[PDB]
Design a protein around this ligand. Structure first.
Ligand SMILES: [Ca+2]
Ligand SMILES: [Ca+2]
Lengths: 219, 229
């Protein structure tokens, strides 16, 4: 019921990274940002997003061996929504004030306040590390920021222009696509979910990629 | 140089869970909360903390296959500090405003604002035994229930039950370790042995509030439930 698109890949089949800002339909509503397992899409992104705007999510707070989780169940209207992951578990790691607002074992329908789509390239002798230093400018604050991305590990015997974008996926992720040395290839750096759902939209629109420096570090 | 102790375990050898609130010593200082790999201690906790108050940490921002990390190197004064993990890597996951403050590949000494110590115990499926730990936020007067998975049990002639009985007391405490963790100890288990369950609450929190949460989140009680799978 409110969207934002980050288009890193424009292609016939592409990986879809979906993240949603939710709010519980109950008397102690918790606000949550969760993301879907990745899936493949063959329809235009602007068109997938519209269909995703009909998303209906149901969560249920549960315990698991690897900490507490949320058993998610989702639905949407549209042909392209047949491939949408319907039932998946997520780590119920929330802002500490939200823990009180998380009723255990109560199947609650959540209400989508924003739906984010990120397009990606479908997935399908040893020293020095090739690392890419992605340079950005926070236009809200006019303060630079450099996020390092590990690329390859090369061996040493005794790129010019690439694109980087801040996208909302595992909270926020930086995705960098290299054009040639190979070919179109993406590196994802996870920045973590520790952030206000409101600021997620803010960061993406204010963090402008300035340039990329490739460095080499002996191991 | 400030300290706080959470004594879940009191024993001859015990697991030490150390977490520190740091601030870089540079011209764009980043504030950081990192925790040490767990280690064993044989000296009193109040005594280990004193020695830990002499902690000197050096971080260096680096890239890794599993996102960006911080190459940590640490030292402290005192005999018990021989066992302290000296060189360890940590995930460099910070509050977003902090990313600008983190300088790539610049070896910076960090300054310890607070040292936290937490003591611990050294270490065909139908239903799940889950413990609902009940707490009260005294600052806000609002309850909070954190569910801990204990074990999977098998019931012959089984249904899909709820609340359970032994086979009544246990203690639970909110402690600063992987940011904040709830640690629950089963006194007279099935009523094996004294056994602890750690629930990770995540590092998503202001270093200041970490001290606040621990002092205000009081354990009210524990309900044992059963959930069919
Ligand atoms: Ca609720
Ligand atoms: Ca700095």
């Amino acid at each position: 019921m409110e969207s934002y698109l980050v288009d890193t890949y424009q292609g016939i089949p592409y990986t879809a990274a979906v993240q949603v800002d939710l709010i519980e339909k109950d008397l102690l509503p918790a606000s949550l940002t969760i993301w879907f397992p990745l899936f493949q899409a063959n329809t235009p992104p602007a068109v997938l997003l519209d269909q995703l705007k009909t998303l209906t999510i149901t969560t249920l707070y549960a315990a698991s061996q690897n900490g507490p989780i949320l058993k998610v169940n989702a639905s949407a209207q549209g042909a392209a929504m047949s491939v949408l992951p319907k039932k998946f578990e997520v780590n119920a790691t929330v802002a500490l004030d939200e823990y009180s607002k998380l009723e255990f074992d109560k199947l609650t329908v959540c209400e989508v306040k924003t739906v984010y789509l990120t397009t990606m390239k479908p997935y399908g002798k040893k020293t020095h590390d090739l690392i890419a230093l992605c340079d950005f400018m926070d236009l809200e604050k006019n303060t630079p920021v450099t996020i390092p991305a590990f690329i390859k590990s090369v061996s040493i015997k005794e790129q010019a222009l690439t694109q980087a974008k801040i996208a909302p996926y595992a909270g926020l992720i930086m995705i960098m696509t290299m054009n040639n040395p190979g070919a179109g290839t993406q590196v994802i750096v996870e920045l973590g979910a520790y952030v206000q759902a409101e600021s997620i939209s803010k960061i993406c629109k204010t963090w402008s990629h300035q340039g990329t420096r490739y460095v080499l570090k002996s191991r």
